[PDB]
Amino acid sequence: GSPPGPPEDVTIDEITDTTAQLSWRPGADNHSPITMYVVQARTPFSVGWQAVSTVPEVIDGKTFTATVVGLNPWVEYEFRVVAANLIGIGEPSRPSENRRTEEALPEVTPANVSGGGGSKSELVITWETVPEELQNGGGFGYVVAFRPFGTISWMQTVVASPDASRYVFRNESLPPFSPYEVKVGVYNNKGEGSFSPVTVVYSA
Amino acid sequence: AEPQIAMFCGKLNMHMNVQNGKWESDPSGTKTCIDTKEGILQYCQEVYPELQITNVVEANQPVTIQNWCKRGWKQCPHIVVPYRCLVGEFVSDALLVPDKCKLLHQERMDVCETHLHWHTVAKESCSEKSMNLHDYGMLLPCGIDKFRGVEFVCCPL
């Protein structure tokens, strides 16, 4: 007896924004009954292959389909299935077809929203770009909002490039080294996300 | 304040002196109104030789300019919509969003349209929500005074 051979014919039957239905067929058990199947996934951003959560939570050796859950929207996924018997965990299957999860509203706001400095009468606002795996859809962009500290009305502008990390508000009447409340939000083709927390940024 | 040119056919072109905030007549005293958006871009670059003029767009509200001249700075009011001389990399406008108002925006990669088209889009969008259009600006230039989107502010009645 020895650990099982590779499962076979792993297919993505359906895929949503956060879930995928997987199916496969058994390989050789090598004279010890297969008692468990586990699913792994790989993205362009993972450190190799990684375990994923499934329904059912534990797939027994008599089950050949399962729903993978907790997937990242708008991310290219491949999956593989591994069998285990009493002797040990077996060899992984060949990977499934590559499929991208569906789009969804963006959920992560930009980190380290800050700013400061610049040339005369400039207000410089900066943030860390939201990485591609957290944009959750095409058409990702930012909304930059700022107002003089203590006022109500917001000044807002749409920064349509997902790779943007900086916005400069140039105005000759803007006062020197004056405090501004600043926040940065996100959106994509599915719709509007949230704003970051408010932080205080001074003009030049 | 902001670089911009203003034209009225039959008169010399005007431009905004950014240093003192006054409208001034054509430096050559010969240039009158221009027919193409490309020619307006070239004139912007001519009268602002120190600035990196990369595009032009209509202003959103007209301005009343006095002391229009004829050829040769002779016989020096007209309410005209000026053209803004846009500088360097495209920077989207900052829009005032008062309390209870909403920032909306639309980007269409398959559409390359005029300032008037996007103004109409924004105005109709606010109206269909039983609101009024206040500020708006262009997004994503695809040509000289051509754009792929709009940002705009809708406010309660």
Residue numbers in the entry:
A (entry chain B): 595 to 798
B (entry chain A): 30 to 105, 109 to 189
Which of the paper's sentences describe this entry?
Because human APP(E1) seemed prone to aggregation, we attempted crystallization of the chicken and mouse complexes. Although both the chicken and mouse complexes crystallized, only the former yielded crystals that diffracted well enough to allow structure determination. The FN1–FN3 region of chicken CNTN4 is characterized by a sharp bend between the FN2 and FN3 domains that appears to be a hallmark of vertebrate CNTNs. The binding site involves the second FN repeat of CNTN4 and the copper-binding domain of APP, though it does not overlap with residues involved in copper binding. In addition, the side-chain oxygen atom of S124 in APP forms a hydrogen bond with T751 in CNTN4, whereas its main chain oxygen atom forms a hydrogen bond with the side chain of Y761.
Contactins (CNTNs) are neural cell adhesion molecules that encode axon-target specificity during the patterning of the vertebrate visual and olfactory systems. Because CNTNs are tethered to the plasma membrane by a glycosylphosphatidylinositol anchor, they lack an intracellular region to communicate across the membrane. Instead, they form coreceptor complexes with distinct transmembrane proteins to transmit signals inside the cell. Finally, structural analyses of five CNTN–amyloid pairs indicate that these proteins interact through a conserved interface involving the second fibronectin type III repeat of CNTNs and the copper-binding domain of amyloid proteins.
